[PDB]
Design a protein around this ligand. Structure first.
Ligand SMILES: Nc1ncnc2c1ncn2[C@@H]1O[C@H](COP(=O)(O)OP(=O)(O)CP(=O)(O)O)[C@@H](O)[C@H]1O
Ligand SMILES: Nc1ncnc2c1ncn2[C@@H]1O[C@H](COP(=O)(O)OP(=O)(O)CP(=O)(O)O)[C@@H](O)[C@H]1O
Ligand SMILES: CC(=O)N[C@H]1[C@@H]2OC[C@@H](O2)[C@@H](O)[C@@H]1O[C@H](C)C(=O)O
Ligand SMILES: CC(=O)N[C@H]1[C@@H]2OC[C@@H](O2)[C@@H](O)[C@@H]1O[C@H](C)C(=O)O
Lengths: 350, 345
């Protein structure tokens, strides 16, 4: 069947909307990105730390969030010439405003009943809560999807997501999935080029590629934001800005490769998703630093790297409806496998 | 199939838990009441008005609420020697901590995923939100149950709930259910017999029936708190109770007959259904209608609300509408609730 997925991460830049076909395999049919208004971003951020009148405030904020998500769905369906009746369900992550598994709770807003009302499509949402109820951390949820896509009996694979930070799913045959953070991804390269050039990121890693790595600075870094970095830059002589960028690229490449090889030395394939997959200069370094592995974008395996996360939530909607587990308890720490999410039906037919 | 219903109203005394059998009819198999600890009641009251750190406070409070609910569920099933496997679903209202349809939101807590984890039973919850999302008030929900129980496009009926106060669901041939308030119910009779003899209520209305309606007072009252009664009484004990009974009987019957003069049957639920003397006067004052307890239709008057929520779980799973749009103001009929499956472990 066909499923929509909606993901809005913690950076609050915007919402990913995806349409998948799910059968034997998972395939991306269409995708759509919608920016988040400054006002909505600011209002969500203010809910991410304790404050006054949170119940009412969250209620007003989630209504705007859902309206935006619904518009995003509408536009994708218009582009695809698809009726909402052709979509089995939307898997919506919602928007995390508090995550405290040590206190046994996780809070994602995004009024799924309202989302069902506005879209006319069944909504599956609230995926993390059952994992936390079963004693897990409620995160990360993507490794179960990584396993469904890429796990097999025969190959040691690492599925590497390079966003602001880097995280990996280790798919070792005959074993359960493992997952951990590898280190920084794009976070410092973004911050540096912003501080220096006003750009939000370094396109294709071209700026970095134009500079030369400074090995002294690199050693200091290996031994994450700007105040931290500035404290480092003061300890070294003035460097050209591009050399700093080149050095920051190498930091991520080395931190990732070192963490990956330490945990899975026999790794045969590293499959890279997230926006970092588009940083050509970074992909180049990762491949040089892991010469015994094939390092490639997930695009080469039929999953476009920018849309992996959104696709996971579409997939989680499918898992719910099929009553199959959606978590990976070895990674989340839950007592065992659980069906994740809650169903808010459109019910258009009355 | 069999369904559990879970209700915890805003008085916060305890949880009503019922077990129904649903087929062609709705029948009560068992019921259980679980008092709420003072500490939990206090913390919920504190979340019913705006205050600090609400997200985290509500999260931790609802964990306790759910643990209690799960205990109530396990206890009822134990009492019946019944495996949770025999139950299709729990319909859980949750606990209302904020309700503001004017700002298009309603908030019931009660972490249904945790409820499913602890009970091992599918949970349907969060019933009010889709009605609100469709432009309705999100309340009251019980008239949809009244309509399903007693509605048909051919007889004029009223379902009268007598609690502290009185409300009625009008079932008119063909029409969606409508509803309204009809003034006081048990509130004054309870207030007065408490103040006068320390009793919580007037059992069977026998105190009121031992007295005579003083017609002066009745006319005054007809022209609601304990000191409000005492204002009236000075300008003039069992006669008083009798006159309070008549007050409710007259105001209720007059409201009902204005709205549907054609009423053929008045079905009474709530604890007032047990007030034999009140029921007698209501029957005298609506002589064209048969006045009877819902118990005469297999629906125990004290357990309507719990039963309504087990029924709403059934309606969700049957893919049938759950709201009463002519009551709530919603755009039309909607499936109410969200499903949190127990699944496998
Ligand atoms: N063409 C490109 N070249 C280099 N980096 C790119 C890029 N496109 C995206 N990125 C990087 O990806 C980051 C965002 O990727 P990410 O996977 O984290 O997206 P997200 O915010 O949806 C979660 C950007 O901040 C940028 O550093
Ligand atoms: N046997 C009886 N005789 C008379 N009145 C009775 C009664 N049993 C219950 N009641 C009345 O019903 C009231 C409780 O009914 P109600 O429907 O309001 O309960 P609740 O759980 O909603 C609060 C009692 O206070 C009393 O007035
Ligand atoms: C509570 C929450 O929203 N966690 C997110 C967050 O954003 C990234 C990281 O922290 C990850 O643990 C998780 O999301 C990804 C998509 C995941 O669940 O795998
Ligand atoms: C928002 C909310 O919890 N409403 C309750 C409340 O308690 C009584 C009254 O206000 C009624 O409107 C409703 O419950 C009843 C059972 C209902 O929904 O029919």
């Amino acid at each position: 069947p066909r499923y929509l997925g909606l993901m809005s991460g913690t950076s609050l830049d915007g919402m990913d909307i995806v349409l998948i076909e799910q059968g034997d395999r998972t395939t991306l049919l269409a995708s759509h990105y919608l920016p988040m208004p400054a006002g909505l971003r600011e209002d969500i951020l203010a809910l991410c730390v304790p404050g006054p009148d949170e119940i009412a405030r969250a209620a007003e904020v989630e209504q705007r969030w859902v309206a935006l998500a619904a518009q995003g769905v509408r536009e994708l369906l218009l582009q695809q010439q698809m009726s909402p009746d052709e979509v089995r369900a939307i898997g919506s992550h919602g928007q995390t405003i508090r995550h405290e598994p040590a206190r046994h709770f996780t809070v994602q807003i995004g009024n799924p009943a309202l989302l069902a009302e506005l879209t006319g499509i069944d909504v599956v949402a609230d995926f993390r809560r059952r994992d936390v109820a079963a004693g897990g951390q409620g995160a990360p949820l993507v490794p179960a999807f990584h396993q469904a896509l890429f796990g097999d009996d025969d190959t040691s694979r690492a599925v590497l997501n390079i966003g602001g930070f880097s995280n990996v799913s280790l798919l070792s045959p005959g074993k359960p999935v493992r997952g951990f953070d590898c280190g920084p991804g794009n976070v410092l390269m973004d911050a540096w080029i912003h501080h220096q050039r006003g750009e939000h990121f370094d396109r294709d890693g071209a700026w970095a590629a134009s500079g030369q790595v400074n090995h002294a600075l690199l050693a200091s870094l290996l031994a994450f934001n700007l105040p931290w970095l500035q404290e480092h830059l003061a300890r070294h002589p003035a460097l050209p800005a591009a050399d700093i960028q080149a050095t920051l690229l190498e930091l991520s490449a080395r931190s990732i490769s070192e963490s990956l090889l330490d945990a899975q030395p026999d790794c045969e394939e590293v499959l890279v998703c997230g926006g970092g997959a588009f940083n050509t200069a970074l992909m180049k370094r990762l491949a040089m630093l892991m010469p015994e592995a094939r390092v490639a974008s997930t695009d080469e395996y039929g999953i476009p790297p920018a849309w992996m996360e959104g696709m996971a939530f579409a997939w989680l909607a499918h898992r719910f409806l099929e009553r199959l587990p959606g978590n990976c308890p070895d990674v989340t720490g839950a007592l065992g496998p659980r069906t994740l999410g809650a169903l808010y039906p459109a019910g258009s037919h009355h």
